[PDB]
């Protein structure tokens, strides 16, 4: 999935 180091990842993905 994306990286939790970027707000986009936390917003464009629920893997965080």
Q: Quote the DSSP letter at residue 2.
A: -
CB atoms within 10 A of CB 9: 15
C-beta separation of 16 from 4 below 8 A: yes
Q: Contact 9/16 with Cβ under 8 angstroms? A: yes
Query: Measured between alpha carbons, how far is 13 from 6 in angstroms, rounded to an integer?
Result: 11
Answer whether 3's CB lies under 8 Å from 10's CB: no
CA-to-CA distance for 16 and 7, rounded, in angstroms? 10
């Amino acid at each position: 999935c994306c990286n939790c180091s970027s707000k986009w990842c936390r917003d464009h993905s629920r893997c965080c």
